[PDB]
């Protein structure tokens, strides 16, 4: 089967937000609203904001999962390539096979789905701190889009789900991601091509 990607704000008005990082050659992570696509370097910090209109219940969680964007590849589990899964760059929590990691959250849990074999990483939703209007999760993406035997140049979508304590859907949003050497240039290029 295939995870839903339908945008759904739900009862709490859940949606993502992204910083405005620009397209300088030196940028390590940058988001294109026109393409709904994040461009980032390998394993670098990718801040993703969570916005809500009202605070969901204690025990609410936030899950991230990757799927292939093209329909003909969508049933294939997105995973790290045969090189990266064996490079012993584990942070002690994330399984070496998982593309998506959460950085700096000791409560992050990594799931290998017993039925679909898909990977995901889930954290507790924390309401914004004092003087803050949103909550930010720092993600790392642990393979290049180009990795042979892995993503193999195929585009992927990251699905972020707000879920209750049982894992039921409360909200959903998504963005494409490209992991590449020069996110600034690739964003500029793809946006030009779009135009």
Annotated binding site: 81, 84, 143, 147
Whole-angstrom distance, CA of residue 66 vs CA of residue 82: 17
| List of residues 6+ apart from 186 with CB closer than 8 A | 39, 178, 180
Please give the structure tokens belonging to residue 143.
């393979």
Token pair recorded at residue 54: 């009202």
In sequence order, the 6+-apart residues with CB closer than 8 A to the CB of 98 are 79, 80, 110, 119, 121, 142
- Binding site for Zn(2+): residue ranges? 81, 84, 143, 147
Contacts of 59 (CB under 8 A, 6+ apart): 124, 164, 165
- Which helix (H) or strand (E) element contains residue 109? strand 109-112
Residues followed by a break in the chain, C–N over 2.5 Å? none
Q: What is the DSSP letter of 73?
A: G
Do residues 187 and 39 touch, judged by C-beta distance below 8 A?
Answer: yes
């Amino acid at each position: 089967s295939v995870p839903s990607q339908k945008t759904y704000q739900g009862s709490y008005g859940f949606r993502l937000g992204f910083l405005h990082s620009g397209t300088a050659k030196s940028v390590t992570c940058t988001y294109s609203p026109a393409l709904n696509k994040l461009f980032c370097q390998l394993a670098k910090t990718c801040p993703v904001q969570l916005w809500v209109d009202s605070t969901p219940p204690p025990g609410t969680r936030v899950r991230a999962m990757a799927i292939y964007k093209q329909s003909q590849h969508m049933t294939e589990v997105v995973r790290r390539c045969p090189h990266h899964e064996r490079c012993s760059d584990s942070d002690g929590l994330a399984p070496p096979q998982h593309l998506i990691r959460v950085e700096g959250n000791l409560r992050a849990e990594y799931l290998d789905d017993r039925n679909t074999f898909r990977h995901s990483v889930v954290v507790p939703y924390e309401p914004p701190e004092v003087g803050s209007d949103c909550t930010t999760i720092h993600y790392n993406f642990m393979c290049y889009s180009s990795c042979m035997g892995g993503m193999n140049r195929r585009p992927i979508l990251i699905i972020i789900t707000l879920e209750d304590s049982s894992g039921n859907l409360l909200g959903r949003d998504s963005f494409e991601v490209r992991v590449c050497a020069c996110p600034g240039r690739d964003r500029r290029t793809e946006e030009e091509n779009l135009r």
